[PDB]
Amino acid sequence: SCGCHEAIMAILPECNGIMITTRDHAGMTPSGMTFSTLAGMIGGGTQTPGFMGIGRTYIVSKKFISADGGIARIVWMPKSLKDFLHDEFVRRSVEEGLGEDFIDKIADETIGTTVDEILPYLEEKGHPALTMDPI
Amino acid sequence: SCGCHEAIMAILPECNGIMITTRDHAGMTPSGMTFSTLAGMIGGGTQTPGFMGIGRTYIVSKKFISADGGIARIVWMPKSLKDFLHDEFVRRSVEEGLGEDFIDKIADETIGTTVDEILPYLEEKGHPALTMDPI
Amino acid sequence: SCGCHEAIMAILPECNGIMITTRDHAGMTPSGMTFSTLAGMIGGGTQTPGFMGIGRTYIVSKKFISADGGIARIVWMPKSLKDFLHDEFVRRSVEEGLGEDFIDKIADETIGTTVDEILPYLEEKGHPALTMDPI
Amino acid sequence: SCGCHEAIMAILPECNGIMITTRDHAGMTPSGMTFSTLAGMIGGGTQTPGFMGIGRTYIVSKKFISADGGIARIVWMPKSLKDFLHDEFVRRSVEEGLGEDFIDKIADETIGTTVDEILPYLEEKGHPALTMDPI
Ligand code: NI
Ligand code: NI
Ligand code: NI
Ligand code: NI
């Protein structure tokens, strides 16, 4: 009704995956835009390739971008979103064969807010997205 | 209301642009999917960005993927769609500084249904998408 | 607002052309379906191709199914539609070299509602579609 | 001779499977068409493919749509059809490794008559069609 679940996903070709941000998160993201700006960009029915609005809980559903590798594609999310989805997200990681600590391989704002800032972290943690087929 | 206006847009990174297909078009598209298959994929919430549903009329609107430089990004559409939108599409082409014959630089099913089939045509005709910044 | 909701086209291979029906025509068409049932299909889940929703005035557009050979392909329309488009249609027929008479070569509900009923009439009247390349 | 007039199949890409309806069932189906409207299409000036007429017992035949993955693709049928084939269908389900309760994962008119109505049910029951390759 009011949009309190609202999140925005964006493709990050250089990380071979997707970032997600949320309405409550003030911070810059690796897409070069805040949630606020992103929302402004798509906000008059102006669909833009590589960006989609989603409900924050769609992220932890079985069908989540399933045929393109599901939650394994997530390479960046705000720490606030990790915390919020944590228990579901972990249980989902496990179901997907990604292990319980997959969430810790995912970059966040404490790591960086640009691709150049987060990519070495993704690399050093061995994030599965980096070796999956092209996004 | 029945989705009479429905079209689907997909990113084609190698053409540095987008393709568009429609319900009434049976044919294979350069995305490697028919409209029907595309729709199947995103009606199930199976869809990642790079594929999305759009209204036929959004295509000729001033705000059409404005952040990405608008209709200049369209590198493939069914001929039936060109014919249908023709007058408005031509007007929009002119307003956008693409010239009246822009629609003829755009590939369609008579040219091919794969990237390898259409890319030479796009090159031949000097399609503006090719020299734009990355889609 | 393209007029999408007001008419539906369908191919009739045996007539080597197309039929059109409209929202105000409740009666049977050579497609074996009414406008309403055709609409139900479009709004349905099959994603069947080949049934374009159009505005009536698209029929008298310059590029009207130009990719398929234009108005010469129309083999059936409701009489109410003939009346609606008459003057424009005749004008278009002249421009296309089909003669002013063309509209009268086109079948309608007074002729029949099936291919078996309308095809001998098309043949009688020397409808140009019959001799054109396959659709 | 083969019972071709008993039932009609149609594809539902967003359920990644097929529906079946019968000459005994007048209810609306997820195809947006009733049996009788489907039959009308068949007979029918358009020659549109994809709507095969079948005998009810074809459904429980060994090679039933084997090319498309067999009975695992069925996502909707009238309850009257489930009852009619029940024992054979269950036997077939077991043989195919789908379990005895497969028939219960399949939607029917008591679940809904549109894709939007039946898709969440399919999802919650874990219908195998959803996990299969694109239909
Ligand atoms: Ni509609
Ligand atoms: Ni419209
Ligand atoms: Ni038979
Ligand atoms: Ni029959």
Coordinates of C-alpha atoms and ligand atoms in Angstrom, one line a residue:
Chain A
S1 CA 0.0 0.0 0.0
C2 CA 2.4 2.6 1.3
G3 CA 5.7 1.2 -0.2
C4 CA 7.6 0.4 3.0
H5 CA 8.9 -2.9 1.3
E6 CA 10.3 -1.0 -1.7
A7 CA 13.7 -1.8 -3.0
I8 CA 15.5 -1.1 -6.2
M9 CA 17.8 -3.6 -8.0
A10 CA 20.4 -2.7 -10.6
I11 CA 22.7 -4.7 -12.7
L12 CA 26.4 -4.2 -12.1
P13 CA 28.0 -5.8 -15.2
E14 CA 31.6 -5.4 -13.9
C15 CA 30.7 -7.5 -10.8
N16 CA 28.8 -9.9 -13.0
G17 CA 25.8 -9.5 -10.7
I18 CA 23.2 -7.1 -9.1
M19 CA 23.2 -4.5 -6.3
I20 CA 20.1 -3.8 -4.2
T21 CA 19.2 -0.7 -2.3
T22 CA 16.3 0.4 -0.2
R23 CA 14.2 3.5 0.7
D24 CA 15.5 3.8 4.2
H25 CA 19.2 3.7 3.0
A26 CA 20.5 7.2 2.5
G27 CA 23.9 6.1 1.1
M28 CA 25.5 6.1 -2.4
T29 CA 25.4 2.8 -4.2
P30 CA 27.7 1.3 -6.9
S31 CA 25.2 2.3 -9.6
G32 CA 26.3 5.9 -9.0
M33 CA 22.8 6.7 -7.5
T34 CA 21.1 6.7 -4.1
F35 CA 17.7 4.9 -3.7
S36 CA 16.2 8.3 -3.7
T37 CA 17.7 9.3 -7.0
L38 CA 17.0 5.8 -8.5
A39 CA 13.3 6.2 -7.5
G40 CA 13.2 9.6 -9.0
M41 CA 14.7 8.2 -12.3
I42 CA 12.1 5.5 -12.7
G43 CA 9.2 7.3 -11.0
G44 CA 6.8 8.4 -13.7
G45 CA 6.3 5.0 -15.3
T46 CA 9.7 5.5 -16.9
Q47 CA 11.1 1.9 -17.0
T48 CA 14.9 1.9 -17.6
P49 CA 16.8 -1.1 -18.7
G50 CA 19.1 -2.7 -15.9
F51 CA 17.0 -1.2 -13.1
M52 CA 13.9 -2.6 -11.4
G53 CA 11.8 -1.8 -8.4
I54 CA 11.1 -4.9 -6.2
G55 CA 9.7 -5.8 -2.8
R56 CA 12.5 -6.4 -0.3
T57 CA 11.1 -9.9 0.5
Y58 CA 11.1 -11.0 -3.2
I59 CA 14.9 -11.2 -2.5
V60 CA 14.4 -14.3 -0.2
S61 CA 11.8 -16.0 -2.4
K62 CA 12.7 -19.3 -4.2
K63 CA 11.9 -17.7 -7.6
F64 CA 14.1 -14.7 -7.2
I65 CA 15.8 -14.1 -10.6
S66 CA 16.0 -17.9 -10.5
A67 CA 17.0 -18.9 -14.0
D68 CA 19.9 -16.4 -13.8
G69 CA 21.3 -17.8 -10.6
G70 CA 19.1 -16.5 -7.9
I71 CA 20.5 -14.8 -4.8
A72 CA 24.1 -15.9 -5.8
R73 CA 23.9 -12.8 -8.1
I74 CA 23.6 -10.4 -5.2
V75 CA 27.0 -8.6 -4.8
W76 CA 26.0 -5.5 -2.9
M77 CA 23.3 -4.6 -0.4
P78 CA 23.1 -2.1 2.5
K79 CA 24.1 -3.6 5.9
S80 CA 20.7 -2.5 7.1
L81 CA 19.1 -4.8 4.5
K82 CA 21.4 -7.7 5.4
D83 CA 20.4 -7.3 9.0
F84 CA 16.8 -7.0 8.3
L85 CA 16.5 -10.1 6.0
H86 CA 19.3 -12.0 7.8
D87 CA 17.5 -15.1 9.1
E88 CA 15.5 -15.7 5.9
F89 CA 18.6 -14.8 3.8
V90 CA 20.8 -17.2 5.5
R91 CA 18.3 -20.1 5.3
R92 CA 17.9 -19.3 1.6
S93 CA 21.7 -19.2 1.1
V94 CA 21.8 -22.7 2.6
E95 CA 19.0 -24.0 0.5
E96 CA 20.8 -22.8 -2.6
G97 CA 24.0 -24.6 -1.7
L98 CA 25.9 -21.3 -1.1
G99 CA 26.6 -21.9 2.6
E100 CA 25.4 -20.0 5.7
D101 CA 28.2 -17.4 5.3
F102 CA 27.3 -16.4 1.7
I103 CA 25.8 -13.1 3.1
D104 CA 29.3 -12.2 4.4
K105 CA 30.8 -12.5 0.8
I106 CA 28.3 -9.8 -0.3
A107 CA 29.7 -6.3 -0.2
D108 CA 28.0 -3.5 1.6
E109 CA 28.5 0.2 2.4
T110 CA 31.2 -0.6 5.0
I111 CA 33.2 -2.0 2.2
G112 CA 32.5 0.6 -0.4
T113 CA 30.0 2.4 -2.6
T114 CA 31.7 2.0 -6.0
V115 CA 32.5 -1.0 -8.2
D116 CA 36.3 -0.3 -7.9
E117 CA 35.9 -0.2 -4.1
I118 CA 34.0 -3.5 -3.8
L119 CA 35.4 -5.6 -6.6
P120 CA 38.6 -6.6 -4.7
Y121 CA 36.5 -7.6 -1.7
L122 CA 34.2 -9.7 -3.9
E123 CA 37.4 -11.2 -5.4
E124 CA 39.1 -11.9 -2.1
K125 CA 35.9 -13.5 -0.6
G126 CA 35.5 -15.7 -3.7
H127 CA 32.0 -14.4 -4.5
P128 CA 30.3 -17.0 -6.8
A129 CA 28.8 -14.3 -9.1
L130 CA 32.3 -13.5 -10.4
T131 CA 32.6 -17.0 -12.0
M132 CA 29.0 -17.5 -13.1
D133 CA 27.9 -17.0 -16.7
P134 CA 27.6 -13.4 -17.9
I135 CA 24.7 -11.5 -16.1
Chain B
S1 CA -6.9 -3.8 -19.5
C2 CA -6.3 -7.1 -21.2
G3 CA -2.7 -6.0 -21.9
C4 CA -3.4 -5.0 -25.5
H5 CA -0.5 -2.5 -25.4
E6 CA 2.1 -4.9 -24.0
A7 CA 5.6 -5.1 -25.4
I8 CA 8.8 -6.3 -24.0
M9 CA 12.2 -4.6 -24.1
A10 CA 15.5 -6.4 -23.7
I11 CA 19.1 -5.1 -23.6
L12 CA 21.5 -6.1 -26.3
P13 CA 24.9 -5.2 -25.0
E14 CA 26.8 -6.0 -28.2
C15 CA 24.5 -3.6 -30.1
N16 CA 24.8 -1.1 -27.4
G17 CA 21.1 -0.8 -27.3
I18 CA 17.7 -2.5 -26.9
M19 CA 15.4 -4.7 -28.8
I20 CA 11.6 -4.5 -28.5
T21 CA 9.0 -7.2 -29.3
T22 CA 5.3 -7.5 -29.0
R23 CA 2.5 -10.2 -28.2
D24 CA 1.3 -10.4 -31.8
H25 CA 4.8 -11.1 -33.1
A26 CA 5.5 -14.9 -33.2
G27 CA 9.1 -14.6 -34.4
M28 CA 12.4 -15.2 -32.7
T29 CA 14.2 -12.1 -31.5
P30 CA 17.9 -11.3 -30.9
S31 CA 17.5 -11.8 -27.2
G32 CA 17.2 -15.6 -28.1
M33 CA 13.6 -15.6 -27.0
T34 CA 10.1 -14.9 -28.5
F35 CA 7.7 -12.5 -26.9
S36 CA 5.9 -15.5 -25.5
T37 CA 8.9 -16.9 -23.9
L38 CA 10.0 -13.5 -22.6
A39 CA 6.5 -13.0 -21.1
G40 CA 6.6 -16.5 -19.5
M41 CA 9.9 -15.6 -17.9
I42 CA 8.7 -12.3 -16.4
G43 CA 5.1 -13.2 -15.7
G44 CA 6.5 -15.6 -13.2
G45 CA 8.7 -12.9 -11.5
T46 CA 11.6 -14.9 -13.0
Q47 CA 12.8 -11.7 -14.7
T48 CA 16.1 -9.9 -14.1
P49 CA 16.7 -6.4 -15.2
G50 CA 17.6 -6.2 -18.8
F51 CA 14.2 -7.5 -19.6
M52 CA 11.0 -5.6 -18.9
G53 CA 7.5 -5.1 -19.9
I54 CA 6.5 -1.8 -21.5
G55 CA 3.5 -0.2 -23.1
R56 CA 3.6 0.4 -26.9
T57 CA 2.9 4.1 -26.3
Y58 CA 5.7 4.5 -23.8
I59 CA 8.0 3.8 -26.8
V60 CA 7.0 7.1 -28.5
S61 CA 6.8 9.2 -25.4
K62 CA 9.2 12.0 -24.7
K63 CA 10.4 10.3 -21.5
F64 CA 11.1 6.9 -23.1
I65 CA 14.3 5.6 -21.4
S66 CA 15.4 9.3 -21.1
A67 CA 18.4 8.6 -18.9
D68 CA 19.7 6.3 -21.7
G69 CA 19.1 8.7 -24.7
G70 CA 15.7 7.5 -25.7
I71 CA 14.6 5.9 -29.0
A72 CA 18.1 6.1 -30.4
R73 CA 18.8 3.0 -28.4
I74 CA 16.3 0.8 -30.3
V75 CA 18.2 -1.5 -32.6
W76 CA 15.5 -4.1 -33.3
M77 CA 11.7 -4.1 -33.5
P78 CA 9.2 -6.2 -35.5
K79 CA 8.1 -4.6 -38.7
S80 CA 4.5 -4.8 -37.6
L81 CA 5.5 -2.6 -34.7
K82 CA 7.3 -0.1 -36.9
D83 CA 4.1 0.1 -39.1
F84 CA 1.9 0.5 -36.1
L85 CA 3.8 3.3 -34.4
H86 CA 5.1 4.7 -37.7
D87 CA 3.8 8.3 -37.7
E88 CA 4.5 9.0 -34.1
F89 CA 7.8 7.2 -34.2
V90 CA 8.9 9.3 -37.2
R91 CA 7.9 12.5 -35.4
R92 CA 9.8 11.4 -32.3
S93 CA 12.8 10.6 -34.4
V94 CA 12.9 14.1 -35.9
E95 CA 12.4 15.8 -32.4
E96 CA 15.3 13.7 -31.1
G97 CA 17.6 14.9 -33.9
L98 CA 17.8 11.4 -35.5
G99 CA 16.2 12.3 -38.8
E100 CA 13.0 11.1 -40.3
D101 CA 14.6 7.9 -41.7
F102 CA 15.9 6.7 -38.4
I103 CA 13.2 3.9 -38.3
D104 CA 14.9 2.5 -41.4
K105 CA 18.3 2.1 -39.6
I106 CA 16.6 -0.1 -37.0
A107 CA 16.8 -3.8 -37.7
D108 CA 13.7 -6.0 -37.9
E109 CA 12.8 -9.6 -38.7
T110 CA 13.4 -9.1 -42.4
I111 CA 17.1 -8.4 -41.5
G112 CA 17.6 -11.1 -39.0
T113 CA 16.7 -12.5 -35.6
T114 CA 20.1 -12.8 -34.1
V115 CA 22.8 -10.3 -33.0
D116 CA 25.3 -11.7 -35.6
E117 CA 22.6 -11.3 -38.3
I118 CA 21.6 -7.7 -37.4
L119 CA 24.9 -6.1 -36.2
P120 CA 26.4 -5.8 -39.8
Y121 CA 23.2 -4.0 -40.8
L122 CA 23.4 -1.6 -37.9
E123 CA 27.0 -0.9 -38.9
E124 CA 26.1 -0.5 -42.6
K125 CA 23.4 2.0 -41.8
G126 CA 25.4 3.9 -39.2
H127 CA 22.9 3.3 -36.3
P128 CA 23.5 6.0 -33.6
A129 CA 23.4 3.5 -30.7
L130 CA 26.7 2.1 -31.8
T131 CA 28.7 5.3 -30.8
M132 CA 26.7 6.2 -27.7
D133 CA 28.0 5.5 -24.2
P134 CA 27.5 2.0 -22.8
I135 CA 23.9 0.9 -22.5
Chain C
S1 CA -4.4 6.0 -26.1
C2 CA -3.6 4.3 -29.4
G3 CA -7.0 2.8 -30.1
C4 CA -5.7 -0.6 -29.3
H5 CA -8.9 -1.7 -27.6
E6 CA -11.2 -1.0 -30.5
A7 CA -10.3 -3.5 -33.2
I8 CA -8.5 -6.8 -33.6
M9 CA -6.8 -8.2 -36.8
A10 CA -6.3 -11.9 -37.7
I11 CA -4.7 -13.7 -40.6
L12 CA -6.8 -15.9 -42.9
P13 CA -4.3 -18.0 -44.9
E14 CA -7.0 -19.4 -47.2
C15 CA -8.0 -15.9 -48.3
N16 CA -4.3 -14.9 -48.5
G17 CA -5.1 -12.0 -46.3
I18 CA -6.5 -10.6 -43.1
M19 CA -9.8 -9.9 -41.3
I20 CA -10.5 -7.2 -38.9
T21 CA -13.3 -6.9 -36.3
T22 CA -14.3 -4.3 -33.8
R23 CA -15.6 -3.8 -30.2
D24 CA -19.0 -2.7 -31.4
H25 CA -19.4 -5.8 -33.7
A26 CA -20.8 -8.6 -31.6
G27 CA -21.1 -11.1 -34.3
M28 CA -19.1 -14.1 -35.5
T29 CA -16.0 -13.6 -37.8
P30 CA -14.1 -15.9 -40.2
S31 CA -11.5 -16.5 -37.5
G32 CA -14.1 -18.7 -35.8
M33 CA -14.2 -16.1 -33.0
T34 CA -16.1 -12.9 -32.0
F35 CA -14.4 -9.7 -31.0
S36 CA -15.1 -10.5 -27.4
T37 CA -13.7 -14.0 -27.5
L38 CA -10.6 -12.7 -29.5
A39 CA -10.1 -10.1 -26.7
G40 CA -10.4 -12.7 -24.0
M41 CA -7.7 -14.6 -25.7
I42 CA -5.4 -11.5 -25.9
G43 CA -5.9 -10.9 -22.2
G44 CA -5.4 -14.5 -21.5
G45 CA -2.3 -16.5 -20.6
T46 CA -1.4 -18.2 -23.9
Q47 CA 0.6 -15.3 -25.4
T48 CA -0.7 -16.5 -28.7
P49 CA 0.8 -14.3 -31.5
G50 CA -0.8 -13.1 -34.7
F51 CA -3.8 -11.1 -33.2
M52 CA -3.0 -7.4 -33.0
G53 CA -5.2 -5.0 -31.2
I54 CA -5.5 -1.8 -33.3
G55 CA -7.3 1.5 -33.6
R56 CA -9.7 1.7 -36.6
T57 CA -7.9 4.7 -38.0
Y58 CA -4.7 2.7 -38.2
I59 CA -6.4 0.9 -41.1
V60 CA -6.3 4.2 -43.1
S61 CA -2.7 5.1 -42.0
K62 CA -0.2 5.4 -44.7
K63 CA 2.0 2.5 -43.4
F64 CA -1.0 0.3 -42.4
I65 CA 0.6 -3.2 -42.4
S66 CA 2.9 -1.9 -45.1
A67 CA 5.3 -4.7 -44.3
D68 CA 2.5 -7.2 -45.4
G69 CA 1.3 -5.2 -48.6
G70 CA -1.1 -2.8 -47.0
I71 CA -4.9 -2.5 -47.3
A72 CA -4.9 -4.8 -50.3
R73 CA -4.7 -7.6 -47.7
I74 CA -8.0 -6.8 -46.0
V75 CA -10.6 -9.5 -47.1
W76 CA -13.2 -9.1 -44.3
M77 CA -14.4 -6.3 -42.1
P78 CA -17.8 -5.5 -40.5
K79 CA -20.1 -3.3 -42.6
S80 CA -20.2 -0.8 -39.7
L81 CA -16.3 -0.5 -40.1
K82 CA -16.6 0.0 -43.8
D83 CA -19.0 2.8 -43.2
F84 CA -16.8 4.3 -40.5
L85 CA -13.6 4.5 -42.7
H86 CA -15.3 4.8 -46.0
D87 CA -14.0 8.1 -47.5
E88 CA -10.5 7.7 -46.2
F89 CA -10.5 4.1 -47.2
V90 CA -11.6 4.9 -50.8
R91 CA -8.9 7.6 -51.0
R92 CA -6.3 5.2 -49.8
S93 CA -7.5 2.5 -52.3
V94 CA -7.0 5.0 -55.1
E95 CA -3.5 6.0 -53.9
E96 CA -2.5 2.3 -53.7
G97 CA -3.8 1.6 -57.3
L98 CA -6.7 -0.7 -56.1
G99 CA -9.4 1.5 -57.6
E100 CA -12.2 3.2 -55.8
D101 CA -14.2 0.0 -55.9
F102 CA -11.8 -1.9 -53.7
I103 CA -13.9 -1.6 -50.5
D104 CA -16.7 -3.4 -52.3
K105 CA -14.4 -6.4 -53.2
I106 CA -14.0 -6.8 -49.4
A107 CA -16.3 -9.3 -47.7
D108 CA -18.4 -8.4 -44.7
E109 CA -21.1 -10.0 -42.4
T110 CA -23.8 -9.6 -45.2
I111 CA -21.6 -11.9 -47.3
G112 CA -20.7 -14.4 -44.7
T113 CA -18.9 -15.2 -41.4
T114 CA -16.8 -18.1 -42.5
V115 CA -14.0 -18.6 -45.0
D116 CA -16.2 -21.1 -46.9
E117 CA -18.9 -18.4 -47.2
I118 CA -16.6 -15.5 -48.2
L119 CA -13.9 -17.1 -50.3
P120 CA -16.1 -17.7 -53.5
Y121 CA -17.1 -14.0 -53.2
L122 CA -13.5 -12.8 -53.0
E123 CA -12.8 -15.0 -56.0
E124 CA -15.8 -13.6 -57.9
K125 CA -14.8 -10.0 -57.2
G126 CA -11.2 -10.6 -58.1
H127 CA -9.9 -9.5 -54.7
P128 CA -6.3 -8.5 -55.2
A129 CA -5.1 -10.4 -52.1
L130 CA -5.8 -13.7 -53.9
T131 CA -3.0 -13.2 -56.4
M132 CA -0.5 -11.5 -54.1
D133 CA 2.5 -13.4 -52.6
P134 CA 1.7 -15.6 -49.6
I135 CA 1.1 -13.9 -46.3
Chain D
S1 CA -11.8 -41.6 -34.0
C2 CA -9.0 -40.8 -31.6
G3 CA -11.3 -38.7 -29.3
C4 CA -9.8 -35.5 -30.8
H5 CA -13.1 -33.7 -29.9
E6 CA -13.0 -34.4 -26.2
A7 CA -10.4 -31.9 -25.0
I8 CA -8.1 -29.1 -26.1
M9 CA -4.6 -28.3 -24.8
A10 CA -3.0 -24.8 -24.6
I11 CA 0.3 -23.4 -23.5
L12 CA 0.7 -21.1 -20.5
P13 CA 4.3 -19.7 -20.7
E14 CA 4.0 -17.9 -17.4
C15 CA 3.2 -21.2 -15.6
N16 CA 5.9 -22.9 -17.7
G17 CA 3.4 -25.5 -18.7
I18 CA 0.1 -26.4 -20.3
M19 CA -3.6 -26.3 -19.5
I20 CA -6.3 -28.8 -20.7
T21 CA -10.0 -28.2 -21.0
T22 CA -12.8 -30.5 -22.2
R23 CA -16.2 -30.5 -24.1
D24 CA -17.9 -31.3 -20.7
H25 CA -16.4 -28.2 -19.0
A26 CA -17.9 -24.8 -19.9
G27 CA -16.0 -22.8 -17.3
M28 CA -13.5 -20.1 -18.2
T29 CA -9.9 -21.3 -18.4
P30 CA -6.5 -19.6 -17.9
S31 CA -6.2 -19.3 -21.6
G32 CA -8.9 -16.6 -21.4
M33 CA -11.1 -18.9 -23.5
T34 CA -13.7 -21.6 -22.9
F35 CA -13.6 -25.0 -24.5
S36 CA -16.2 -24.0 -27.0
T37 CA -14.4 -20.8 -28.0
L38 CA -11.1 -22.8 -28.3
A39 CA -13.0 -25.3 -30.6
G40 CA -14.4 -22.4 -32.6
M41 CA -10.8 -21.2 -33.2
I42 CA -9.7 -24.7 -34.4
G43 CA -12.4 -24.8 -37.0
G44 CA -11.5 -21.8 -37.4
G45 CA -10.1 -19.7 -40.4
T46 CA -6.7 -18.7 -38.9
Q47 CA -4.7 -22.0 -38.9
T48 CA -3.2 -20.9 -35.7
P49 CA -1.0 -23.7 -34.3
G50 CA -0.5 -24.7 -30.6
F51 CA -4.0 -25.8 -29.7
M52 CA -4.1 -29.5 -30.1
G53 CA -7.4 -31.4 -30.0
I54 CA -6.9 -34.6 -28.0
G55 CA -8.7 -37.6 -26.5
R56 CA -8.8 -37.5 -22.7
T57 CA -7.0 -40.8 -22.4
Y58 CA -4.0 -39.4 -24.4
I59 CA -3.2 -37.6 -21.2
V60 CA -2.4 -40.9 -19.4
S61 CA -0.7 -42.5 -22.4
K62 CA 3.0 -43.3 -21.9
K63 CA 4.3 -40.9 -24.6
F64 CA 1.9 -38.0 -23.6
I65 CA 3.7 -34.9 -24.8
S66 CA 7.0 -36.6 -24.2
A67 CA 8.8 -34.0 -26.3
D68 CA 7.8 -31.3 -23.8
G69 CA 8.4 -33.3 -20.6
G70 CA 5.2 -35.3 -20.2
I71 CA 2.4 -34.9 -17.6
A72 CA 4.7 -32.9 -15.4
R73 CA 3.8 -29.9 -17.7
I74 CA 0.1 -30.0 -16.8
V75 CA -0.7 -27.0 -14.6
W76 CA -4.4 -26.8 -15.0
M77 CA -7.3 -29.1 -15.7
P78 CA -11.0 -29.1 -14.8
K79 CA -11.8 -31.1 -11.6
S80 CA -14.2 -33.3 -13.7
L81 CA -11.1 -34.3 -15.8
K82 CA -9.0 -35.1 -12.8
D83 CA -11.8 -37.4 -11.5
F84 CA -12.2 -39.0 -14.9
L85 CA -8.6 -39.9 -15.3
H86 CA -7.8 -40.2 -11.6
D87 CA -6.5 -43.7 -11.0
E88 CA -4.6 -43.9 -14.3
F89 CA -3.2 -40.4 -13.8
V90 CA -2.0 -41.2 -10.3
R91 CA -0.3 -44.4 -11.5
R92 CA 1.4 -42.3 -14.3
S93 CA 2.5 -39.7 -11.8
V94 CA 4.2 -42.4 -9.7
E95 CA 5.9 -43.9 -12.8
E96 CA 7.3 -40.5 -13.7
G97 CA 8.8 -39.9 -10.3
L98 CA 6.3 -37.1 -9.5
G99 CA 4.7 -38.7 -6.5
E100 CA 1.1 -39.9 -6.0
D101 CA 0.0 -36.4 -4.9
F102 CA 1.2 -34.7 -8.1
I103 CA -2.5 -34.4 -9.3
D104 CA -3.1 -32.2 -6.2
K105 CA -0.3 -29.8 -7.2
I106 CA -2.3 -29.2 -10.4
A107 CA -4.7 -26.2 -10.4
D108 CA -8.3 -26.5 -11.4
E109 CA -11.5 -24.3 -11.4
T110 CA -11.8 -24.4 -7.6
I111 CA -8.4 -22.7 -7.5
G112 CA -8.9 -20.2 -10.2
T113 CA -9.6 -19.5 -13.9
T114 CA -6.7 -17.1 -14.6
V115 CA -2.9 -17.3 -14.5
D116 CA -2.8 -14.6 -11.7
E117 CA -5.2 -16.8 -9.7
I118 CA -3.4 -20.1 -10.2
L119 CA 0.3 -19.1 -10.3
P120 CA 0.7 -18.5 -6.5
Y121 CA -1.0 -21.9 -5.9
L122 CA 1.4 -23.6 -8.3
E123 CA 4.3 -21.9 -6.5
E124 CA 3.2 -22.8 -3.0
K125 CA 2.6 -26.5 -4.0
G126 CA 6.0 -26.7 -5.7
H127 CA 4.6 -27.7 -9.1
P128 CA 7.5 -29.3 -11.0
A129 CA 6.7 -27.4 -14.2
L130 CA 8.0 -24.3 -12.6
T131 CA 11.6 -25.8 -12.2
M132 CA 11.7 -27.3 -15.7
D133 CA 13.3 -25.9 -18.8
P134 CA 11.2 -23.3 -20.7
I135 CA 8.2 -24.9 -22.4
Ligands
NI1 NI -7.0 -4.1 -22.4
NI2 NI -3.3 3.3 -26.6
NI3 NI -10.2 -39.2 -33.7
NI4 NI -14.6 -31.3 -35.5

